[PDB]
């Protein structure tokens, strides 16, 4: 249960998101969760009225097993009233990480784990601990 290293997750952008709101397209933010972890999920900022949001927002997670653990990204639409509705999601195993390399991925958004839902572009940088 002791952390092997730290993975730096950059949420870069989404491209081609579906229209969801009656006007303005969507107000997207991303939730990021790491499997086999009790840390509450992280989220990006809300981008208002943008189907091609650009975030470049960075998050850090403690890694306890690079072989087993997977990240889950979920794109939600913000509204002031009501619960955010999920627009799409996908998963990304940490066994695709590379130590000390920025590695970029394009995840197609899907309904669950069909209509096209856009792409999410992210980066991972794995910094393992030494000695
Ligand atoms: Cl926000
Ligand atoms: Ni970094
Ligand atoms: Ni660098």
Numbering used by the authors: 256 to 368, 378 to 395
Which sentences did the original study use to describe this structure?
Synaptotagmins (SYTs) are the plant orthologous of E-Syts and regulate the ER–PM communication in response to abiotic stress. In vivo studies showed that SYT1 is anchored to the ER through an N-terminal hydrophobic region and binds to the PM through the two C2 domains at the C-terminal end. Similar to other C2 domains, SYT1C2A folds as a four-stranded β sandwich with a Ca2+-binding site placed in a cavity formed by three loops connecting the two sheets (L1, L2, and L3).
Unexpectedly, we were able to solve the structure of SYT1C2A with one cadmium ion (Cd2+) at site II using different crystallization conditions. This structure mimics that with one Ca2+ at the high-affinity binding site. Interestingly, the comparative analysis of the structures of SYT1C2A in complex with Ca2+ and Cd2+ shows that Glu 334 at L3 changes its conformation to replace a water molecule at site II, whereas the positively charged side chain of Lys 275 replaces the Ca I. In this conformation, SYT1C2A might be unable to bind membranes through this site as Ca II would be occluded to interact with the phosphate moiety of phospholipids. Thus, these data might provide the structural basis for Ca2+-mediated activation of SYT1C2A to bind membranes. The metal binding site of SYT1C2A restricts the metal–metal distance to 3.7 Å.
